[PDB]
Structures are given as C-alpha cells and as structure tokens.
Design a protein around this ligand. Structure first.
Ligand SMILES: Nc1nc2c(ncn2[C@@H]2O[C@H](COP(=O)(O)OP(=O)(O)OP(=O)(O)O)[C@@H](O)[C@H]2O)c(=O)[nH]1
Ligand SMILES: [Cl-]
Ligand SMILES: [F-]
Ligand SMILES: [Mg+2]
Ligand SMILES: [Mg+2]
Ligand SMILES: [Mg+2]
Ligand SMILES: [Mg+2]
Lengths: 160, 275
C-alpha cells in the first residue's frame, strides 16, 4: 500500500475556480455531503499525475480544460474520526495526507462531466463563493480546508 | 496568537476579527474576557467575520456586545466590515454581499474607500411611521407644550420626525427632544432630528434617538433628515450630513428610488492576543 508508517494515505485535492472567483463544489455519490474533489495517489505516479487522472475520471476535465495556478508546498494532513477507521484492514489508514492544487477552468462549464467513470464518487456540482467551503465541509476536514483556502486566496483575489 | 484589528465607524469603536482564516469560537465567556480592557482587548462592540451560510453570498458577520450577547441592529458595523475584508485580502470585490442577524445586504466600497449602504425607500405614509395624521403632507403642525412647531415625518424602518433649526449648537435638544419623542401622535415614539440647513448639499444635525436620547452618530436619522428635506423641496439629490460623531453622505432620487448612505471606516490598529 501507499499508507506511510504513520497511517496516512497520500492524497491529492483539487480546487477549481472560474473567472468570477467561484469554486467548484461537488456532491458525493448517493450522499448528502459536498466537498472538493480529492483522490488517492497511485503507485508510481507523482502528485500532479494523480491530480490530472482524478480530475478527468471524477470531473471529466482534460489537461487542456484547466490551468494550474498554484499548489500547496508540503503535505496537509487530517485524521479520520476514529468512528470511521477500518481497524481490520491492514495496514490501517488513520488519516489522509494531501497536496492541494488550485486550477482555473479554462474551458466552458459544458466540459464538466461527472459521469466519465463507471464508479463515480460524485453525482453533482455547482459554483459556490470562495469561502463557502470552509463552513460547509465536514468537520474533520475543516482545518485543512481553512489552511488551503487561506493559502490560495491571494491568487484567486488577484484575478478579475 | 489570534489576530484582530481595531476600527472606528459611526462614532463607535469596533474590535474586528477574521474568523474566516482563523479557527475561533466566540462563547459569551470569551467575549466578556475580550471586552475587559485589562485582561483582554477592550471594545465597544466586537465584529466577527465568518464564512457565508449561503453559496451566493461572500461572508457572514456578527456583532457582540461587552456582555457577550449577539446584537441585531440593522446595518450596524457594515462600513468597517466591508473595508476590513478588503484590507485583509479576504476579497477584492467592491460590491460585497453579506448576511447579518438582520438579513442580507449588498455593500459597495467606493474608490475613495468609503462604504455605501442601500437603506431602501423612505415611507411618508403616516400609517406606517406610525403617525396620528389624516394624510401625508410635506409639513405638519404640532403643538408641543407652549410652542407650535413645524416638522416632516418619515419612516425608514423606524419612525422619524425632523424639524429645521437655524443652528444645532443653539438647539433646544434636551428640552424639546423628549417632548416630541414621546408625543401622543407617535404611538411607538419617534426619533426627533434637528436639522440646520447650511446649503442645499450640506447639513449639520443632532438627533434625539427614540429611547436613548442624543447619540453622537445615528445613521437612520441622517437618512431621515435628508429624505424629508428633499421631499420638502429644500435639498439637492446628494447631501453631506455632519453629526457630532462624524460626516455621512446621503443620496436619494426621490420616491420610487432607494436611498443610499455612504460613510467612512477608520482602520486604527492591528493586534495579537493569546486565548
Ligand atoms: N458527512 C460527510 N462524510 C464524509 C465526507 N467525506 C468523507 N466522508 C465519509 O468518510 C469516509 C472517508 O472519508 P474521506 O477521507 O473523505 O475518504 P474518501 O473521500 O472516500 O477518499 P478519497 O476520495 O479517495 O480521497 C467516507 O466513506 C464517507 O462515508 C464529507 O465530506 N461529509
Ligand atoms: Cl488529458
Ligand atoms: F478518489
Ligand atoms: Mg475522490
Ligand atoms: Mg480515491
Ligand atoms: Mg476518486
Ligand atoms: Mg483514487
């Protein structure tokens, strides 16, 4: 597995903004909860490669649909609430360790398609104001999200 | 170290806190501790900027008093909020949409770093002020004690009765204020304003508020005195208003239009405090 010896699985997170400073907010399949797209890094691929792969399979966006504006320099970690840790699965994953990417959607909204995958983790999306995700994300991701949106704010604010 | 700023608007001193990029919970115990000028920071009111509840708005902010209670006065602290989120890089917008305890507003930061608020359309129908009168007029007569006076009456959410003085330092504010504030023709009382017209575009004004008396800054009174002076034909479409607390600038195109109030917000200091 990719789980390091602390129990953190390497992970990539995606913040997609438009030219009006909104960010893409995605609903998880068959659930009430919304979040930014995120996915595990696979063996042999780097963070950026895992990002482009997860971007296409879950959001349907190509390399030419977006532009990389920024990325977080080091790992951001959150621990799963112990209610959700699957202890019988070894090596046990007690949390996720994430590198975050800020993308600008270069193409039109019509190039988003959340069904390019047989196994969609998301069944819907909408644009939301920049800081809305900090309140609405599930509690155990909130510290990561606040740090991410704080780091990315200057880039998004300095566009139109 | 939780960071904060001190700001000033409407003759009021605000402690302003970015709770968007900072993780802080403002329990009433923490608020009273922060209001203590020796243990905490000391403030008239505390303004807390939060992420929005609605995906279409940019922020939510709350105001707490020194007792630790949330305060819901419409428009309160709007000018310092709008400038603060821009000063701190939380947004670059000039039209900022925000929710408060009294609903939502659109705040506009003009290029002179003043903040403009849409206060809605004034209502002169005496039924909705409320005012004991048979129908609306540009001026009313009222016998107050041993003295007959002239006045205009308008509601901006709250009742207002405005009368023209010829200087506000020479104004009978403490002897005349209470008599008309609790006048029988005002079933819910009214804020009484003493308006000295200096020019069609310039006014000085003191206000005897409904329950409080003279506050150094009352925004609704400045809106009311200009709304009546315009409807009475005495004032231009854009008036400067000078109160003991500072200067506001009102703008209103007459009935059918909303009235706009523009005011300053002063950033006086930044600070740290460990909680
Ligand atoms: N209410 C709520 N539950 C969530 C949320 N995200 C995840 N969960 C639950 O927590 C479990 C694991 O959480 P995550 O860390 O997000 O795992 P994951 O998103 O499936 O992992 P990747 O998408 O591959 O990064 C999931 O099976 C969900 O049941 C959320 O945003 N809100
Ligand atoms: Cl591609
Ligand atoms: F994933
Ligand atoms: Mg995923
Ligand atoms: Mg995954
Ligand atoms: Mg996935
Ligand atoms: Mg994956």
């Amino acid at each position: 597995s990719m789980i390091d010896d602390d129990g953190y699985r390497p992970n990539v997170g995606i913040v997609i903004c438009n030219r009006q400073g909104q960010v893409m907010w995605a609903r998880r399949f068959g659930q009430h909860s919304w979040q930014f797209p995120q996915g595990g890094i696979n063996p042999g691929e780097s963070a950026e490669q895992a990002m482009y792969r997860e971007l296409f399979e879950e959001v349907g966006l190509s390399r030419k649909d977006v532009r990389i504006l920024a990325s977080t320099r080091n790992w951001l970690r959150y621990k799963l609430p112990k209610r959700l840790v699957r202890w019988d699965t070894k090596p046990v994953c007690i949390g996720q360790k994430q590198k975050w990417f800020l993308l600008q959607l270069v193409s039109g909204d019509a190039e988003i398609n959340m069904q390019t995958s047989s196994t969609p983790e998301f069944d819907g999306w909408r644009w939301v104001s920049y800081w809305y995700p900090v309140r609405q994300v599930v509690s155990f991701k909130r510290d990561v999200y606040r740090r991410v949106m704080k780091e990315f704010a200057s880039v998004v604010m300095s566009l139109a | 170290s939780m960071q904060f700023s001190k700001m000033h608007g409407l003759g009021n001193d605000f402690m302003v806190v970015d709770a968007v990029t900072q993780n802080v919970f403002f329990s009433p115990e923490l608020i009273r501790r922060l209001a203590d000028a020796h243990l905490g920071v000391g403030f008239d009111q505390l303004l807390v900027v939060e992420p929005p509840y609605d995906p279409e708005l940019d922020f939510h902010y709350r105001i707490f008093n020194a007792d630790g209670s949330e305060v819901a006065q419409c428009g309160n602290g709007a000018r310092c909020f709008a400038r603060f989120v821009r000063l701190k890089g939380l947004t670059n917008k000039r039209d900022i949409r925000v929710s408060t305890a009294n609903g939502r507003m659109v705040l506009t930061v003009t290029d002179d770093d003043l903040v403009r608020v849409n206060m809605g359309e004034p209502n002169f129908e005496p039924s909705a002020v409320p005012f004991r009168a048979n129908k609306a007029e540009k001026t009313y007569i009222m016998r107050a004690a041993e003295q007959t006076i002239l006045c205009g009456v308008v509601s901006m959410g709250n009742p207002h009765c405005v009368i023209q003085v010829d200087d506000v330092d020479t104004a009978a504010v403490e002897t005349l204020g209470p008599v008309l504030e609790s006048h029988e023709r005002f079933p819910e009382r009214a804020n009484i304003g003493f308006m000295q017209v200096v020019k069609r575009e310039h006014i000085r004004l003191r206000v005897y508020e409904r329950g409080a008396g003279e506050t150094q800054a009352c925004g609704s009174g400045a809106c009311a005195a200009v709304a009546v002076g315009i409807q009475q034909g005495l004032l231009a479409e854009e008036v400067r208003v000078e109160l003991p607390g500072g200067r506001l600038d009102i703008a209103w195109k007459g009935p059918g239009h909303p009235l706009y109030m523009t005011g300053p917000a002063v950033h006086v200091a930044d600070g740290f405090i460990h909680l």
